[PDB]
Design an enzyme around this catalytic site. Structure first.
Site, PDB file in Angstrom:
ATOM      1  N   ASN A  20      39.187 -34.091   5.304  1.00  0.00           N
ATOM      2  CA  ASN A  20      39.580 -35.408   4.797  1.00  0.00           C
ATOM      3  C   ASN A  20      38.462 -36.434   5.106  1.00  0.00           C
ATOM      4  O   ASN A  20      38.143 -37.280   4.265  1.00  0.00           O
ATOM      5  CB  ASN A  20      40.909 -35.860   5.440  1.00  0.00           C
ATOM      6  CG  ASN A  20      42.163 -35.371   4.744  1.00  0.00           C
ATOM      7  OD1 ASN A  20      42.983 -34.646   5.326  1.00  0.00           O
ATOM      8  ND2 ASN A  20      42.368 -35.799   3.497  1.00  0.00           N
ATOM      9  N   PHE A  21      37.847 -36.302   6.296  1.00  0.00           N
ATOM     10  CA  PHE A  21      36.828 -37.188   6.843  1.00  0.00           C
ATOM     11  C   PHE A  21      35.402 -36.573   7.064  1.00  0.00           C
ATOM     12  O   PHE A  21      34.544 -37.234   7.654  1.00  0.00           O
ATOM     13  CB  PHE A  21      37.393 -37.860   8.132  1.00  0.00           C
ATOM     14  CG  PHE A  21      37.742 -37.006   9.353  1.00  0.00           C
ATOM     15  CD1 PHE A  21      38.008 -35.641   9.228  1.00  0.00           C
ATOM     16  CD2 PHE A  21      37.833 -37.579  10.622  1.00  0.00           C
ATOM     17  CE1 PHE A  21      38.327 -34.862  10.358  1.00  0.00           C
ATOM     18  CE2 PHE A  21      38.156 -36.801  11.749  1.00  0.00           C
ATOM     19  CZ  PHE A  21      38.401 -35.450  11.608  1.00  0.00           C
ATOM     20  N   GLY A  22      35.170 -35.340   6.591  1.00  0.00           N
ATOM     21  CA  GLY A  22      33.884 -34.649   6.748  1.00  0.00           C
ATOM     22  C   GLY A  22      33.698 -33.288   6.080  1.00  0.00           C
ATOM     23  O   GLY A  22      34.514 -32.869   5.251  1.00  0.00           O
ATOM     24  N   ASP A 137      45.174 -28.808  16.088  1.00  0.00           N
ATOM     25  CA  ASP A 137      44.944 -28.295  14.750  1.00  0.00           C
ATOM     26  C   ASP A 137      44.740 -26.777  14.736  1.00  0.00           C
ATOM     27  O   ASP A 137      43.930 -26.255  13.979  1.00  0.00           O
ATOM     28  CB  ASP A 137      43.758 -29.054  14.111  1.00  0.00           C
ATOM     29  CG  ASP A 137      43.651 -29.019  12.596  1.00  0.00           C
ATOM     30  OD1 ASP A 137      44.697 -28.883  11.928  1.00  0.00           O
ATOM     31  OD2 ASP A 137      42.523 -29.153  12.081  1.00  0.00           O
TER      32      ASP A 137
HETATM   33  C1  J2I Z   1      34.984 -30.876   8.458  1.00  0.00           C
HETATM   34  O1  J2I Z   1      34.566 -29.538   8.241  1.00  0.00           O
HETATM   35  C2  J2I Z   1      35.474 -28.514   8.229  1.00  0.00           C
HETATM   36  C3  J2I Z   1      35.695 -27.695   9.355  1.00  0.00           C
HETATM   37  C4  J2I Z   1      36.588 -26.609   9.275  1.00  0.00           C
HETATM   38  F1  J2I Z   1      36.858 -25.817  10.325  1.00  0.00           F
HETATM   39  C5  J2I Z   1      37.220 -26.309   8.072  1.00  0.00           C
HETATM   40  C6  J2I Z   1      38.163 -25.140   8.071  1.00  0.00           C
HETATM   41  C7  J2I Z   1      37.889 -24.150   6.971  1.00  0.00           C
HETATM   42  O2  J2I Z   1      38.723 -24.050   6.065  1.00  0.00           O
HETATM   43  N1  J2I Z   1      36.707 -23.407   7.013  1.00  0.00           N
HETATM   44  C8  J2I Z   1      36.490 -22.433   5.921  1.00  0.00           C
HETATM   45  C9  J2I Z   1      35.035 -22.241   5.521  1.00  0.00           C
HETATM   46  N2  J2I Z   1      34.186 -22.072   6.708  1.00  0.00           N
HETATM   47  C10 J2I Z   1      33.232 -21.099   6.774  1.00  0.00           C
HETATM   48  N3  J2I Z   1      32.410 -21.130   7.898  1.00  0.00           N
HETATM   49  C11 J2I Z   1      31.588 -20.165   8.194  1.00  0.00           C
HETATM   50  N4  J2I Z   1      30.763 -20.240   9.285  1.00  0.00           N
HETATM   51  C12 J2I Z   1      30.662 -21.121  10.359  1.00  0.00           C
HETATM   52  C13 J2I Z   1      31.375 -22.338  10.523  1.00  0.00           C
HETATM   53  C14 J2I Z   1      30.916 -22.836  11.738  1.00  0.00           C
HETATM   54  C15 J2I Z   1      31.233 -24.031  12.560  1.00  0.00           C
HETATM   55  N5  J2I Z   1      30.045 -21.905  12.221  1.00  0.00           N
HETATM   56  N6  J2I Z   1      29.809 -20.897  11.360  1.00  0.00           N
HETATM   57  C16 J2I Z   1      31.401 -19.163   7.185  1.00  0.00           C
HETATM   58  C17 J2I Z   1      30.570 -18.061   7.089  1.00  0.00           C
HETATM   59  C18 J2I Z   1      30.915 -17.393   5.882  1.00  0.00           C
HETATM   60  C19 J2I Z   1      31.891 -18.152   5.248  1.00  0.00           C
HETATM   61  N7  J2I Z   1      32.199 -19.215   6.056  1.00  0.00           N
HETATM   62  N8  J2I Z   1      33.172 -20.141   5.856  1.00  0.00           N
HETATM   63  C20 J2I Z   1      34.250 -23.160   7.690  1.00  0.00           C
HETATM   64  C21 J2I Z   1      35.684 -23.479   8.094  1.00  0.00           C
HETATM   65  C22 J2I Z   1      36.975 -27.104   6.938  1.00  0.00           C
HETATM   66  F2  J2I Z   1      37.578 -26.872   5.769  1.00  0.00           F
HETATM   67  C23 J2I Z   1      36.110 -28.200   7.024  1.00  0.00           C
END
Ligand code: J2I
EC number: 2.7.10.2
Length: 293
Positions: A20-22, A137
């Site tokens: 929602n914010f990032g 969360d």
């Molecule tokens: C405000 O930002 C946010 C934060 C959240 F946590 C979510 C929750 C959510 O739905 N996801 C789905 C997609 N996702 C993801 N990340 C991967 N790698 C990774 C993430 C980090 C920190 N380290 N490495 C990865 C590798 C392959 C596919 N992906 N897909 C991130 C989280 C958000 F939607 C928004």
């Protein structure tokens, strides 16, 4: 200072998630410019606002302070100016969120494996609780998959530090809240504690055992039990009422009795009667060993 990341050397590769914010991006931090830099995860804000920036600076500090196998690694910060925009640099976990990973490899993921992940979330959560941090969360979309045998809690956007004189934290929104994961006291009183994190962990345990079946998701199940003809403010009212009258999420298909009991105990209306993360892990590890050799 390795913790300081130069902006000009951060090559955008892909957007991973939006909030929602990032947002969260896949980048390659390549200072030598020779394409030998490591791929990192970059979280950034979408609203320039001072109240969201302060929250974000607090989030950076909470993550910097966390060192555990089941918590995404903090790598550093990225500044641009004096008042800046600020970017949080984290390690890249290649198998994505636990929600997306499970949804795609449901055929490959045993109950034993689901329970190995469960125990890892519990351990990460218990570690959080020692620092007096409330996550607020807990959901599969916020759990990352490092490899087939390891999950990490991967986002701390709503995490709060408990005041020194209280065991709960009272906090608003202002927009849209993940209601279908909230404890009754978080719904009615806006109270967040280790116990409301346990309630939400119960919903995570539910998510895992449904193998992310869309018709069987917490919002879909609750909305059926309430009536899909419901407004908005009425949705929270009826949800409060259903929860109050011992209305709960059903036992997912194939889910053993022992595991649904864990879920229902996490779903106690009485804040103090909910299990602890340490005991949760203890029961889960016991069950894993009964299922295995
Ligand atoms: C405000 O930002 C946010 C934060 C959240 F946590 C979510 C929750 C959510 O739905 N996801 C789905 C997609 N996702 C993801 N990340 C991967 N790698 C990774 C993430 C980090 C920190 N380290 N490495 C990865 C590798 C392959 C596919 N992906 N897909 C991130 C989280 C958000 F939607 C928004």
């Amino acid at each position: 200072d390795p913790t300081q990341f130069e902006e000009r050397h951060l090559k955008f590769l892909q957007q991973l998630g939006k909030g929602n914010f990032g947002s969260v991006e896949m980048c390659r931090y390549d200072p030598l410019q020779d394409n030998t830099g490591e791929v990192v995860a970059v979280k950034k804000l979408q609203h320039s606002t001072e109240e969201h920036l302060r929250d974000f600076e607090r989030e950076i500090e909470i993550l910097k302070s966390l060192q555990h196998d089941n918590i995404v690694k903090y790598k550093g910060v990225c500044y641009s100016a004096g008042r800046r925009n600020l970017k949080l640099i984290m390690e890249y976990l290649p198998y994505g969120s636990l929600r997306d990973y499970l949804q795609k490899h449901k055929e490959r993921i045993d109950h034993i494996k689901l329970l190995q992940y469960t125990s890892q979330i519990c351990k990460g959560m218990e570690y959080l609780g020692t620092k007096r941090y409330i996550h607020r969360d807990l959901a599969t979309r916020n759990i990352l998959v490092e490899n087939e045998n390891r999950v990490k809690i991967g986002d701390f956007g709503l995490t709060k530090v408990l005041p020194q004189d209280k065991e709960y934290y009272k906090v608003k929104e202002p927009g849209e809240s993940p209601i279908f994961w909230y404890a009754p006291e978080s719904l009615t009183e806006s109270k967040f504690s280790v116990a409301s994190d346990v309630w939400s962990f119960g919903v995570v345990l539910y998510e895992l055992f449904t193998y992310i079946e869309k018709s069987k998701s917490p919002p879909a199940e609750f909305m059926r039990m309430i009536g899909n003809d419901k407004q908005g403010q009425m949705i929270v009212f009826h949800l409060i009422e259903l929860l109050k009258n011992n209305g709960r999420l059903p036992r997912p298909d194939g889910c053993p009795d022992e595991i649904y009991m864990i879920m229902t105990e996490c779903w106690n209306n009485n804040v103090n009667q909910r299990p602890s993360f340490r005991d949760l892990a203890l029961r889960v590890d016991q069950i894993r060993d009964n299922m295995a050799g």
